[PDB]
Design a protein around this ligand. Structure first.
Ligand SMILES: COc1cc2c(cc1OC)CC(NC(=O)c1nc([C@@H]3CCCN3C(=O)CSc3ccccc3Cl)[nH]c(=O)c1O)C2
Ligand SMILES: [Mn+2]
Ligand SMILES: [Mn+2]
Length: 180
C-alpha cells in the first residue's frame, strides 16, 4: 500500500538519512511504509541534527542521534565519565564540547512555545540544552542561547521551509501538519 508520502521522502532526503530513519523506526517496531508522516518527520529531524553539527568548529559536536540505542548510550556515558556532566535521563541528540552540555533538537509544526514546554517537562533534565525549530522559521533555545551563529541557523530554517513547500505542492502538508 505504497503512499505518495513514502516516495516523496525518498527523493527529498539523501539515502544515508533515509537509511538511518528506516533503522530507527524498525528498531522501535514501526513501519515506514504505513506510518509515513512519522517517516518524514524522523528524516527531517535527522537532517536538522546533521546540519546543526556542521555549524560549529570541526570537532565541536559529538553526534548521538542516528546511532543505535546501545552505542548512543555508550557515547553518552563516555562523555559523562570524562567531562563530569550529569547523565541525562533520556537520549540527547548532540554534545557540545565547547559549551559542555547535551542538546536535544526539536522540529515541530506547532508553535515553538507549546512544543518547548512539553520537551522541558518530559526530559526533566535540568542540564540538557533545548533547541526548537519550526517549519515557519521560528526558533527557541534554552536561556536564549542559540549555540550557533545566525547564518548556520538560517540555513536550517530555509531547508525546513523548503521541505514544507515541497509537501504542500504535492498536497501532503495538511495531512503532515495534522499528524503532530
Ligand atoms: C519509541 O520510543 C522512544 C524512541 C526514542 C526515545 C524514547 C522513546 O520512548 C521510550 C529517545 C529517542 N527520541 C528522540 O531522540 C526524539 N524523539 C522525539 C519524539 C518526541 C519524544 C518521543 N519522540 C519520538 O519520536 C518517539 S518514536 C521514534 C523515535 C525515534 C525513531 C523512531 C521512532 Cl518511531 N523528538 C525529538 O526531537 C527527539 O530527538 C528515540
Ligand atoms: Mn534524539
Ligand atoms: Mn531531538
Amino acid at each position: 500500500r505504497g503512499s505518495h508520502m513514502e516516495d516523496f521522502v525518498r527523493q527529498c532526503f539523501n539515502p544515508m538519512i533515509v537509511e538511518l530513519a528506516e533503522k530507527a523506526m524498525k528498531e522501535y517496531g514501526e513501519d515506514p511504509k504505513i506510518e509515513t508522516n512519522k517517516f518524514a518527520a524522523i528524516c527531517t529531524h535527522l537532517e536538522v541534527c546533521f546540519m546543526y553539527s556542521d555549524g560549529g568548529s570541526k570537532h565541536r559536536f559529538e553526534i548521538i542521534e542516528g546511532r543505535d540505542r546501545i552505542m548512543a548510550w555508550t557515547v553518552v556515558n563516555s562523555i559523562c565519565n570524562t567531562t563530569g556532566v550529569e547523565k541525562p535521563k533520556f537520549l540527547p541528540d548532540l554534545y557540545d564540547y565547547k559549551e559542555n552540555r547535551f542538546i536535544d533538537i526539536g522540529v515541530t509544526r506547532r508553535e515553538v512555545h507549546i512544543y518547548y514546554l512539553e520537551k522541558a517537562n518530559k526530559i526533566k533534565s535540568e542540564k540538557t540544552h533545548i533547541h526548537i525549530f519550526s517549519f515557519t522559521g521560528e526558533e527557541m533555545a534554552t536561556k536564549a542561547d542559540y549555540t550557533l551563529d545566525e547564518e548556520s541557523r538560517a540555513r536550517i530554517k530555509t531547508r525546513l521551509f523548503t521541505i514544507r513547500q515541497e509537501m504542500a505542492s504535492r498536497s501532503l502538508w495538511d495531512s503532515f501538519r495534522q499528524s503532530e
